Structure 1
Amino acid sequence: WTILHYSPFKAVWDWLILLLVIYTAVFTPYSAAFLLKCQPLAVVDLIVDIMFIVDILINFRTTYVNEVVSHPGRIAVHYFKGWFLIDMVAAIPFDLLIFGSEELIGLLKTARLLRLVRVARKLDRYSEYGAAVLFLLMCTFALIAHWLACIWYAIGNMEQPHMDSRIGWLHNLGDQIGKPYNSSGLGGPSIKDKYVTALYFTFSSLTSVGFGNVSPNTNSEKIFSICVMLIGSLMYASIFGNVSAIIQRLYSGTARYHTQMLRVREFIRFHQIPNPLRQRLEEYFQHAWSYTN
């Protein structure tokens, strides 16, 4: 058998794998930052890993254009020359292969972030619709804010148990919500308080509003904020440049319509057109425009 790459099955499968790549982009950075020391999430994480291996089999059994190539040997060799390496490294189950704690293993499972490359390949499918690229651009913004929230928590959590003298952002969070840290590192804020504060601070940093309660005090926190001010300004020159451009592209029929209507209105004023003729001019423009766009 062989799947045609343009078929309605392969279209639905590629949009299903977009949602599983978004699951990887959320829960892999989160587990590596917040959770390092069956459940519904533990079985879902296995189901998703199985579907990312099934997608390797579909890539051995899909046609390609280089009109179409359909021979299984020329398909398999094209994948082995192309993306099979990255798609395989994104699937190696290192948790079953290494023993050196669950911290090393859970950090090594960040190799799953190579699944973002499956979305970077298939942009010919995903970018075709204006409403789909608006969904992509807002998910890219919300995922950059989330990955930075995981890095910001790693910077806090790698300094809170140190000889910090109560300066870093996690001690200040403990004081600000009335959940202070004891000297042994016991007590303190919950994982919900620490995650919600980290995500709040990185949306605050990226959108460039500082409400004054979370702020960087250690040199590592300040160097992280210098980097997020560089990222946030390149990202606003790119993402929110493109988001407004796609909104203005969706609005483009109406933007042209107002422009041509005002040219007709000024022509009507300049020639001082009488009402029995004027109605025929402006009703003709409405008929012609609604007919042809």
Structure 2
Amino acid sequence: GTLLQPTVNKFSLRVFGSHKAVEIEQERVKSAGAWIIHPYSDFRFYWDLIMLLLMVGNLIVLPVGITFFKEENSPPWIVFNVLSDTFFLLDLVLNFRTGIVVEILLAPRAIRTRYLRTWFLVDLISSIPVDYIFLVVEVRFTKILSLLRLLRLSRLIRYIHQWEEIFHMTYDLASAVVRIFNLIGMMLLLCHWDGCLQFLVPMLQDFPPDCWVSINHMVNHSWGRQYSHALFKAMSHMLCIGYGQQAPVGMPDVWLTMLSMIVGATCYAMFIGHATALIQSLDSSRRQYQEKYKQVEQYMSFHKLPADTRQRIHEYYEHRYQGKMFDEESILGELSEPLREEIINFTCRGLVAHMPLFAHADPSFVTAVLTKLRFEVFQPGDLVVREGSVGRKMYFIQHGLLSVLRLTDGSYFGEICLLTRGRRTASVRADTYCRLYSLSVDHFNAVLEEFPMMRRAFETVAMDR
């Protein structure tokens, strides 16, 4: 009873909402008629799996059995076509009930009319055994009518695109890979049908003496050898190679060769387009860094900077972004509030634990300080703090080595200047590339204004010193 209703999985929770959001859709399926199928249920998924396997089997086997074999009266050929057309006739009946994702679940007002207006005629032609009707009522004209079963490609293309739009939502998949697999699966099928058609056309003309089958003397070999030579001819026309020694003499050979060349040329052009779209999406973060550095060196060339400054800015961007493009401010802006706190507790927590003033504080005070740190990268030779300055910023050390006028990683300098609000006494020069965390004086005074209990403690520090 509940197999026709949408179950609660990851896809239904992502496409509807909570569990209560899925219960409303289940009640909506209940508010429809007697037995109405929902297109996200498990019954429709199992049925579409069975039908997709049958469509692949029929669209591979049916041209080969028609074109390369003797008669349509052999006993495995009749049982295979009658039992398959029964299942494709049940797929016509069950499409009156499923409803169309635009969802539509009301019956029979919108489903039946929206199905009759769009896809009923093609499914009706590809469902019924048309050739057996003309055979019972009334021989080589029935082999043309048996190719109406190849209109089951239209409901194959519909049923593949219904699953992929689901499975882009359930999983994380690249769209280029899915689309190029769809293109490869179409190209193989068109080459197979063209290989069957190359031998189908001279067979209806009782093998004229100018066709390739009578020239190469392969009228009475096995069907495998005939299929191999016909597929070689169709693939050499498809990939635009050049076949044979003489130009085609008969009139249906010329036009069908030209049709094969046009279809192969446009399929190969679409394959090149998909391969280019796949290759351009591989190295995006490497490419955007290159474009950004092109703009940087263009800014250098506009103001006519010297060569040493150009080299120095290049070394700075190499040690800053590392050939890798990102923008930390927008990434920290997009995240939520518990996710920003978790990243800072990995990077900035351990350096503040070295400082004796912040170690004894409450954790409600420390986390407000940790959000206002800023990441800075320096060079060997750069003077970090200069003498005679106001000293507004306090620095923590993550990596690198620097000297006061040696301080290794995990240290700190300029701490007492933010408390005394006076002139800096010493000067600091970086010995190598340093990674620092900076705290300004106003960003600390705001947090002192947020907590008056910690404000009393730093007043007792200032009275002692």
TM range (shorter): 0.7 to 0.9
Aligned equivalents of 1:40, 1:22: Cα separation in 2: 19
Aligned equivalents of 2:176, 2:43: Cα separation in 1: 22
1:59 Cα deviation after fit: 0.5
TM-score, structure 2 length as denominator?
0.49
1:36 Cα deviation after fit: 4.4
SS in 1 for 2:325: helix
Any residues of structure 2 matched to 1:22-41 within 5 Å, and which?
Answer: 22-37=56-71
1:173 Cα deviation after fit: 2.4
Any residues of structure 2 matched to 1:129-208 within 5 Å, and which?
Answer: 129-159=175-205, 161-162=207-208, 164=209, 167-174=210-217, 188-208=220-240
Which residue of structure 2 aligns with residue 57 of structure 1?
A: 93
Aligned equivalents of 2:78, 2:327: Cα separation in 1: 59
1:89 aligns with 2:132: no
Contact kept? 2:207, 2:214, Cα under 8 Å: no
Any residues of structure 2 matched to 1:54-133 within 5 Å, and which?
Answer: 54-65=90-101, 67-94=103-130, 96-97=132-133, 98-99=135-136, 103-121=140-158, 124-125=161-162, 128=165, 129-133=175-179
Aligned equivalents of 1:39, 1:258: Cα separation in 2: 62
CA deviations on 1:194-227 (whole Å, 9 max, x unpaired) are 1111111011011011364797343432333233
Aligned equivalents of 1:214, 1:47: Cα separation in 2: 45
CA deviations on 1:166-186 (whole Å, 9 max, x unpaired) are x32112322xxxx6x6xxxxx
1:172 corresponds to which letter in structure 2? I
Contact kept? 1:160, 1:171, Cα under 8 Å: no
Q: How big is the alpha-carbon RMSD for the aligned residues of Structure 1 and Structure 2?
A: 3.6
Aligned equivalents of 1:12, 1:252: Cα separation in 2: 37
Q: In structure 2, which of residues 268, 271, 290 is the aligned counterpart of residue 240 of structure 1? A: 268
Aligned equivalents of 2:327, 2:46: Cα separation in 1: 39
1:60 Cα deviation after fit: 1.5
Contact kept? 1:201, 1:214, Cα under 8 Å: no
1:29 Cα deviation after fit: 2.5
SS in 1 for 2:40: coil
Which residue of structure 2 aligns with residue 21 of structure 1?
A: 55
Deviates more, 1:279-288 or 1:202-211: 279-288
Indicate the structure (1 or 2) with the bigger Cα radius of gyration.
2
Distance 1:244 1:266, change over 3 A: same
1:17 corresponds to which letter in structure 2? M
Distance 1:246 1:12, change over 3 A: farther
Which residue of structure 2 aligns with residue 280 of structure 1?
A: 320
1:243 corresponds to which letter in structure 2? F
Contact kept? 1:264, 1:282, Cα under 8 Å: no
SS in 1 for 2:128: coil
Aligned equivalents of 2:270, 2:258: Cα separation in 1: 24
Bigger share in helix = 1
Aligned equivalents of 1:114, 1:274: Cα separation in 2: 61
Deviates more, 1:251-260 or 1:65-74: 65-74
1:139 Cα deviation after fit: 2.4
1:53 Cα deviation after fit: 1.8
CA deviations on 1:239-291 (whole Å, 9 max, x unpaired) are 33333333344444424223213235556776323757632232763796xx8
Bigger share in strand = 2
Compare relative contact order (CA 8 Å, sep 6+) and give the higher one, 1 or 2: 1
Contact kept? 2:127, 2:149, Cα under 8 Å: yes
Which residue of structure 1 aligns with residue 286 of structure 2?
A: 258
1:121 Cα deviation after fit: 4.4
TM-score, structure 1 length as denominator?
0.73
SS in 1 for 2:262: helix
Aligned equivalents of 1:127, 1:252: Cα separation in 2: 23
Aligned equivalents of 1:101, 1:195: Cα separation in 2: 32
Distance 1:287 1:19, change over 3 A: farther
Distance 1:9 1:247, change over 3 A: farther
Matched residues, percent identical? 24
